[PDB]
Amino acid sequence: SAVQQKLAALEKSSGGRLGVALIDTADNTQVLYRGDERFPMCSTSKVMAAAAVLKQSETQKQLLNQPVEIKPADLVNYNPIAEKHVNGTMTLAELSAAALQYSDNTAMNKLIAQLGGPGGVTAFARAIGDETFRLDRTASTLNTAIPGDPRDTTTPRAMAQTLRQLTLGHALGETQRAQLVTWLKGNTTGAASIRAGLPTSWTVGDKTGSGGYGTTNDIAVIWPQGRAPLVLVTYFTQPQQNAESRRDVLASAARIIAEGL
């Protein structure tokens, strides 16, 4: 189709490897580009960890309100929220918001720990029917994005389906589903990625990721005017370890989709 050719041209112009999955919930049509190839997730895995804690809170009533100590050993590279609470506490709700809306890596690691480690995040993925997602390491290591390394990867097709199930489907209870969507709509890190390729009147909830090898990712639920919601996953990675981020490539992918379908 014309969209897949435009995505192939975008990829050629980029010098990298582009993976796209769009789900149009109006008729459940799916458009894939490298949709079954594995990409490093980087920080887009924070949605699965936040959703896993929300799932836990369906049966542990006041779980999201529980305080979690932030200790010196918890501090990592990038923790713009958690560093302000070292030797203090944050609630699991606050850690979820910090992970999703600021991509705070200390916050993510507190969620992973709350789930029993990377294997607990993965086990939740399996519980909601995602057999492709794998989380193998904590937040510092998970962004290394070395080519050929299957750790901390998924495919565009799998992540779009999972994001659909979590935000538009029935993977979470209704209060939890709404809270996840509220957090994604308040993301602060996504203006240059999928959002930049979409009309400004469309509502977006998204989670970005960035990592080594110029890896630049964004996963989004989109509510256009005049049509049913869309789920869009855009993954991108490059051959040089120190390649620069290409959020503009993600925005171009979104524009192709928004104009072409």
Q: Which residue is it, tokens 């890896």?
A: 215
Does 16 sit near ligand CAZ (CB under 6 A)? no
Of the listed 43, 45, 96, 252, which one is catalytic?
43
Residues just before a chain gap in the chain (C–N exceeding 2.5 Å) are none
User: Catalytic residue at 43?
Assistant: yes
Does 138 sit near ligand CAZ (CB under 6 A)? no
Q: Which positions from 174 through 193 interact with ligand CAZ, judged by CB under 6 A? A: 189
Out of 96, 101, 143, 155, point to the residue binding ligand CAZ (CB under 6 A): 143
Q: Which residues, other chains included, contact 71 with Cβ-Cβ below 8 Å and sequence gap of 6+?
A: 86, 87
Does 212 sit near ligand CAZ (CB under 6 A)? yes
Does 91 sit near ligand CAZ (CB under 6 A)? no
Does 196 sit near ligand CAZ (CB under 6 A)? no
Does 210 sit near ligand CAZ (CB under 6 A)? yes
Task: Give 129 or 186: the residue with its C-beta nearer to ligand CAZ.
Answer: 186
Does 109 sit near ligand CAZ (CB under 6 A)? no
Does 153 sit near ligand CAZ (CB under 6 A)? no
**Closest approach of Cβ 212 to ligand CAZ, in Å?**
4
Does 105 sit near ligand CAZ (CB under 6 A)? yes
Calpha distance 111→88 (Å, rounded): 16
Catalytic residues, by residue number, are 43
Give the residues lining the site for ligand CAZ (CB under 6 A): 42-43, 77-78, 103, 105, 143-144, 189, 208-212, 245
